[PDB]
Write a protein that binds this ligand. Structure first.
Ligand SMILES: *[C@@H]1O[C@H](CO)[C@@H](O[C@@H]2O[C@H](CO)[C@@H](O)[C@H](O)[C@H]2NC(C)=O)[C@H](O)[C@H]1NC(C)=O
Ligand SMILES: *[C@@H]1O[C@H](CO)[C@@H](O)[C@H](O)[C@H]1NC(C)=O
Ligand SMILES: *[C@@H]1O[C@H](CO)[C@@H](O)[C@H](O)[C@H]1NC(C)=O
Ligand SMILES: *[C@@H]1O[C@H](CO)[C@@H](O)[C@H](O)[C@H]1NC(C)=O
Ligand SMILES: *[C@@H]1O[C@H](CO)[C@@H](O)[C@H](O)[C@H]1NC(C)=O
Ligand SMILES: *[C@@H]1O[C@H](CO)[C@@H](O)[C@H](O)[C@H]1NC(C)=O
Lengths: 596, 248
């Protein structure tokens, strides 16, 4: 005769009904990503539509559940997630603007165009067309055209579409009793109902900004250092007194600076840590690449992979007619079914991606005992940062010499670590200001205190201040270059990548202290330590059933999002960068110098 | 049948060969509770009722005496001190289909715990709240019946394992059927211990000229001294005498 026993009956009914429907949709989506036919797109959408419509019926039934008397916390978190109305609050004339706009945005992003205006020779897709002009060439004139080949040919048609998108997605928050749509994405980090453990939605803006005043002095010296080794390819085209152009930062958007490693190597005379040539001497294949990753995990203490994955998943590119994309993604089909979807290669990245993409799988069966609504990560940053802590460990020279990939006689001097640490700094430190700035811009435009004519003059003036990028060409408000990125166009919360770095290094210091490694964090290893495996597995198995702030106290002992155990990873790099920047102009103000 | 419709059929008047199970090389949960696999062959108990049902891989551990849970509490409860064995094996090749095997159902909610060795067949709906349900699903009806989903691609954890339960209890009924005690190597003209069904002794085994009727097991001549046995595996009558002895 209590609502508490009535909710446990309903959640027990929903868990068995949803996991049957979710497995059919996940199995249909797996076949779409392996064997593309004309009917397979309709076949996946048929099962995926009835799964989305199933949640519409269950959300209305759980609404009549009053929350003010449920003392149990396991079902309180389940009822809060199940009762999210989402698109049910909108009218029929307004709900049709979601699926129409989002599929037009995705189709627009799928159009690859590098054909020159008034010179129509040929142009390929994004991966074969756009990536070669950004990762290999060192010419300023065509890269400026290539910067304008996508930000003036794809983003020009999004202004009437994306501004209409940010005025109706913003209205759901008042209908869902949220502040704005930027506040809606912070509900994943929101914790309520526990005394002293509560995480407010508005304190997260402050905590991200509070951790940024020590990221900045690392990024101040990184940007100062990288501007002296960039003017070698462009002598008279950039001044070493201001900021950097946007089309010279590794990517089209400057998210990852991995392609600047070849241009800005400190001391390239001694050979780098490269074992791509080592695997082709020993005849490595797709099976042996993932087999050494599996024995790496069981040496830590995690359970090994099941027998229904090696003979069931695909590893290479199969056949000739199957033109399916094999971007490295982790699949959680449920009911004990776990798959990895990627194309294997004997390279540095694919060997690390083999370790990286398995970690999301190793996180997925950990909360397999949890109910279906709690069968997820603690937040959006846990499931990405867990899959990357083994990528830091697998790239260490100690782990590479353990298997036998590296040479048995490889000395470890100063520069053998600065070359490795600076490669990690361009892909980790360089993406923190880009991730924070874009989410700060998206949060305020979702708040609504940014007029229509002030998108670019505020977006560009903060890119110049925080990130430190001079615009290669001035742009008015009709340009829409911030919407060109993959995550912003497909409705992905990008704040999960800023907290990914701050999580993947909080766990690294906790696991290295558990393994009792004598040395710095760059040479540390996780394998051959069952004490570190048991420390990680206790927090992986919790899932969303416990608050994420309780997951931190199980590994690091700090209930807040700690940023201190990330500067300690780059202290060998940071102390050298402070000595290298004795005469360079470190620290930029606002700089309209090059393109006034 | 389903877990909530487990059958109960008596096994009697026949020999149950438990040796073939040991060398099957396909079992995964061949465990015995309250008895040993080796010592249930020489001696046996009546009431060999066998229960047939399908239990998922994750819920195999729930099916054990002295252990509670969901299946053991609302579907089929094993009584404490259950002197029997549990035998299970995988049935993925046959007890599975694409799209979900919607042929096995189970009870998810019950007002009271199931009495051990009770089979319940009813359409009564659960009463989570106070307001009665009049057959129309509402906020407190919660139709407990649900269909399991088994697929060939399902993980080993939830793989549908074919499991059978054998019970062995010694009630007031004697003269029951036991397991296999195949044979030893018979020896003739040598002082050898013999223990047939109901009698034992020592002596010399040799051929006999006398004839026994087809409804006896042994015989005696004088002063209740056994001197001839007719073993049933050979259908032959033999003569038994104590082996040579005397005072030197
Ligand atoms: C982790 O443990 C494994 C298992 O002992 C180590 O593998 C051994 O490596 C040494 C030399 O590298 C060999 O002589 C042994 O034969 C290996 N053992 C086996 C079972 O193959 C591995 O080196 C350890 N790695 C670290 C970093 O400690
Ligand atoms: C794979 O796709 C091709 C055409 O794209 C189709 O003919 C074939 O039947 C498919 N095979 C499987 C196993 O899906
Ligand atoms: C909530 O209910 C579950 C049901 O098993 C129980 O395990 C858990 O301890 C309960 N939590 C609280 C705080 O009562
Ligand atoms: C979802 O929509 C229904 C229909 O109006 C409404 O009663 C309910 O309060 C909404 N849920 C939330 C959380 O606002
Ligand atoms: C996983 O480890 C267990 C324990 O040693 C072993 O029995 C099993 O065969 C292993 N499975 C695989 C696929 O390696
Ligand atoms: C690193 O640099 C310092 C400063 O010159 C030097 O003393 C030290 O020997 C170097 N380390 C190695 C391993 O050469």
């Amino acid at each position: 005769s209590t609502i508490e026993e009535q909710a446990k009956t309903f959640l027990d009914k929903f868990n068995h009904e949803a996991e049957d429907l979710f497995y059919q949709s996940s199995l249909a989506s797996w076949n779409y990503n392996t064997n593309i036919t004309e009917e397979n797109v309709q076949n996946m959408n048929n099962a995926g539509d009835k799964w989305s419509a199933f949640l519409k019926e269950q959300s209305t039934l759980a609404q009549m559940y009053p929350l003010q008397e449920i003392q149990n916390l396991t079902v309180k978190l389940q009822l809060q997630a199940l009762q999210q109305n989402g698109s049910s609050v909108l009218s029929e004339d307004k709900s049709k603007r979601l699926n129409t706009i989002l599929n037009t945005m995705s189709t627009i992003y799928s159009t690859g165009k590098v054909c020159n205006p008034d010179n129509p020779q040929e142009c390929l897709l994004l991966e074969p067309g756009l990536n070669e002009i950004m990762a290999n060439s060192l010419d300023y004139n065509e890269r400026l055209w290539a910067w304008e080949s996508w930000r003036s040919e794809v983003g020009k048609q999004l202004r009437p579409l994306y501004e209409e998108y940010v005025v109706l997605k913003n209205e759901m928050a008042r209908a869902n009793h949220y502040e704005d749509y930027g506040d809606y994405w912070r509900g994943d980090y929101e914790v309520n109902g526990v005394d002293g453990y509560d995480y407010s939605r508005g304190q997260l803006i402050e905590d991200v900004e509070h951790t940024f005043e020590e990221i900045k002095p690392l990024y101040e010296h990184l940007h100062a250092y990288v501007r002296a080794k960039l003017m070698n390819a462009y002598p008279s085209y950039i001044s070493p007194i201001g900021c950097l152009p946007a089309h010279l930062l590794g990517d089209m958007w400057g998210r990852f600076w991995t392609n600047l490693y070849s241009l800005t190597v400190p001391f390239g005379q001694k050979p780098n840590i490269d074992v791509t040539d080592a695997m082709v001497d020993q005849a490595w294949d797709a099976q042996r690449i993932f087999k050494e990753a599996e024995k790496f995990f069981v040496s830590v203490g995690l359970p090994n992979m099941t027998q229904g994955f090696w003979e069931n998943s695909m590893l290479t590119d199969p056949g000739n007619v199957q033109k399916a994309v094999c971007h490295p993604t982790a699949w959680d089909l449920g009911k004990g079914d776990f798959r990895i979807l990627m194309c294997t290669k004997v390279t540095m990245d694919d060997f690390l991606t083999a370790h990286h993409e398995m970690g999301h799988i190793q996180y997925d069966m950990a909360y397999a005992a949890q109910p279906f609504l709690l069968r997820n990560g603690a937040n959006e940053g846990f499931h990405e940062a867990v899959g990357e802590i083994m990528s830091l460990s697998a790239a260490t020279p100690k782990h590479l010499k353990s298997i036998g990939l590296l040479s048995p006689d490889f000395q470890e001097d100063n520069e053998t670590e600065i070359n490795f640490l600076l490669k990690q700094a361009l892909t980790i430190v360089g993406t923190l200001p880009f991730t924070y700035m874009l989410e700060k811009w998206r949060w305020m435009v979702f708040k609504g205190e940014i007029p229509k004519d002030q998108w670019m003059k505020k977006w560009w003036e903060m890119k110049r201040e925080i990130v430190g990028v001079v615009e290669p060409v001035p742009h008015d408000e009709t340009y829409c270059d911030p919407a060109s990125l993959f995550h912003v166009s497909n409705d992905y919360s990008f704040i999960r990548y800023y907290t990914r770095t701050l999580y993947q290094f909080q766990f690294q210091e906790a696991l290295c202290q558990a393994a009792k490694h004598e040395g710095p964090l760059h040479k540390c290893d996780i394998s051959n330590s069952t004490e570190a495996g048991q420390k990680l597995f206790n927090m992986l198995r919790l899932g969303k059933s416990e608050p994420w702030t309780l997951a931190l106290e199980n590994v690091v002992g700090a209930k807040n999002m700690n940023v201190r155990p990330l500067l300690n990873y780059f202290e060998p790099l940071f102390t050298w960068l402070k000595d290298q920047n004795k005469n360079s102009f470190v620290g930029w103000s606002t700089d309209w110098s090059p393109y006034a | 049948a389903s877990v909530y419709a487990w059958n109960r059929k008596r096994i009697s008047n026949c020999v149950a060969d438990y040796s073939v199970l040991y060398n099957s090389a396909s079992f995964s949960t061949f465990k015995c509770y309250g008895v040993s696999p080796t010592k249930l062959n020489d001696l046996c108990f009546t009431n060999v009722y066998a229960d047939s049902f399908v239990i998922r891989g994750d819920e195999v551990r729930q099916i054990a005496p002295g252990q509670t849970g969901k299946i053991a509490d609302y579907n089929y409860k094993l009584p404490d001190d259950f002197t029997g064995c549990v035998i299970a094996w995988n049935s993925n090749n046959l007890d599975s289909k694409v799209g979900g095997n919607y042929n096995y159902l189970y009870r998810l909610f019950r007002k009271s715990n199931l009495k051990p060795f009770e089979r319940d067949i009813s359409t009564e709906i659960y009463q989570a709240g106070s307001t009665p349900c009049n057959g129309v699903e509402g906020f407190n009806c919660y139709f407990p019946l649900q269909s399991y989903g088994f697929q060939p691609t399902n993980g080993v954890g939830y793989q549908p394992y074919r499991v059978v339960v054998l019970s062995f209890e010694l009630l007031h009924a004697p003269a029951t059927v036991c397991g296999p005690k195949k044979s030893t190597n018979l020896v003739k003209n040598k002082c050898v211990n013999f223990n047939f069904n109901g009698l034992t002794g020592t002596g010399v085994l040799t051929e006999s000229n006398k004839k026994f009727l087809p409804f006896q097991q042994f015989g005696r001549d004088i002063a209740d001294t056994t001197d001839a046995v007719r073993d049933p595996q050979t259908l032959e009558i033999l003569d038994i005498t104590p082996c040579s002895f005397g005072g030197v």
